[PDB]
Symmetry: C6
């Protein structure tokens, strides 16, 4: 049950075959209330954290960003764009974890089945 994430520019510490230097996500969350909530995710403190801090503190948009979930072979593809790192929130104690909120224009949701059933949408412009 592994989660991964890719950002243009940013480069993670991940080390699997089909994709190296991804970000290793621990938990991902977001909602659709029509309005969209920011994407919230948590990871270790790792090599992206400086980049993350930076992207955030720079407001630099992000051409793409891709979330993936696979059970211990993947099956779930979350595809966000035009992305602005809202907040980075380090924290630690004697772990060190790191939550982030991001602000995206659109998202495509891919769900691969033993085929697929896809779904996306633009929020800055209400088109399927």
């Amino acid at each position: 049950y592994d989660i991964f994430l890719k950002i243009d520019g940013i480069d993670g510490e991940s080390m699997d075959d089909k994709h190296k230097n991804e970000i290793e996500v621990l938990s991902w969350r977001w909602n659709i209330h029509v309005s969209v909530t920011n994407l919230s995710f948590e990871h270790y403190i790792d090599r992206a954290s400086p980049n993350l801090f930076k992207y955030c503190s720079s407001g630099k948009h992000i051409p793409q960003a891709i979330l993936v979930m696979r059970k211990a072979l993947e099956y779930l593809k979350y595809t966000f764009t035009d992305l602005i790192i809202a907040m980075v929130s380090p924290s630690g104690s004697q772990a060190s974890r790191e939550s982030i909120e991001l602000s995206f224009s659109t998202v495509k949701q891919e769900y691969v089945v033993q085929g697929t059933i896809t779904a996306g949408y633009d929020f800055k412009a209400n088109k399927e």
Copy 2:
């Protein structure tokens, strides 16, 4: 125990005999106060998730919804008309749950026990 629900259009991931391709449901909840509440429920991120995205994000209306409970033979059925996905919240950590809302108009409340006992109502049109 065994909770299953149908949405016209939305198929689920059911492998069951008296209904396959139905949404396996984990929790459900709805209040009345007389303004009825959005119905909430929480399934695995499964094959309905992308369409639940859509019906939500389309704000499209649904012909019929039917909720079924039974034990570990179906005892409890809930039936609903003009359905509008109010909210959809997918999330995951290393469950992957998705907590959904639904605005509706009528509800039918059957229950196999005399045989059955049923009471309905329409909350837009105030009638039976």
Copy 3:
């Protein structure tokens, strides 16, 4: 230890001796905030549920409903006159519950010590005993 509620028309499922087809309550609370709180209680999903939904939806008057507590042997009895169903809050999970609130105007508390009875009553609409 054992609670049974009895409402007019609306019928529980229970197969007791000293009651029958009565509502099997799993929890109740009520308060006197002189203001009176509504009563709430939570039973399984049982034959009374559409009735309560009906009576909640209709808002139709009920003459009375009666709650009784009992060991595990009666011992505690509440009587309430005049009743309107306010909130029904069913739910379920692969743990089927059903909250019910409801508004009344009078309460009679009947306590039967293990010897006599101690009773107290009131009317809230018309301040009276």
Copy 4:
């Protein structure tokens, strides 16, 4: 660790000897700020619950009540004067509880050790 509460007219159920027909308390509390808080306490549902409901329903002043903490032997006293029944919340679920609030105009504290340390106060009208 026994707690017994004596209030005229309202009878508890205490099997004890140095005070029978006494409200077996299970929990209590009160502040001073300098408008005192109420007094909250909690007993099983008992013969006192009818006497405490009516007395709440009527709201009839109660002259004097006495509060006792003992050890598993009487060591702690409180004396409250001018007392009104404000709230009563019997819960039940297959403890069998009923919490109370009351309002005093004057409270006494008394505490035995090798001496006994005593103090009271009137609050409706401020004086010692």
Copy 5:
């Protein structure tokens, strides 16, 4: 660990060789939000409880009270100008009473194993 407290006026029940007749303090917390919260400590209901009532009821000024934590005496806390505001006895079948006091100065003296570090401030006088 141990925590003892000695108040001008109020006699305790702790038996320590260096300082019997102090308050055996259970907990305590305080800040400088410059704005100072109250001291807020905790103790079993003991001989000090009536006098604290008296002071809390009578609002009488307390020149000084002194705070000690030692292991199972690194911390010495000094406060002056003290008044009793909250007092909250509460029982059940722990017999507790929390208190909050208002202090104009504090002197925080930390011993080291060595000597002491020393820290004091007049919030009212904004000096030291």
Copy 6:
């Protein structure tokens, strides 16, 4: 899991060999929103709580504080123009003590263990890096 914090003038009590008179930090956090949270860390009540007391109440400008994490020197943060907001001892029968810090600028320094180091910082009070 070893977290140390070097503050200038506020001496420490930390018995480690790459650095002594260091603070033993228990837990820390902070949040960007641009707009930054204060710094937040916890420690026991130790030699620094008097030093940290004054720096708070007297509000003296801290040049710099340096925070490090390392496993049972891989993460560094540098904060400058610092002032102690609030001090908070407590304890009972752990003596805990949390403190909060307000920096003008922060650096962030992650050495990667085997090839490189990724770094990031910023001046907020003059919206610059």
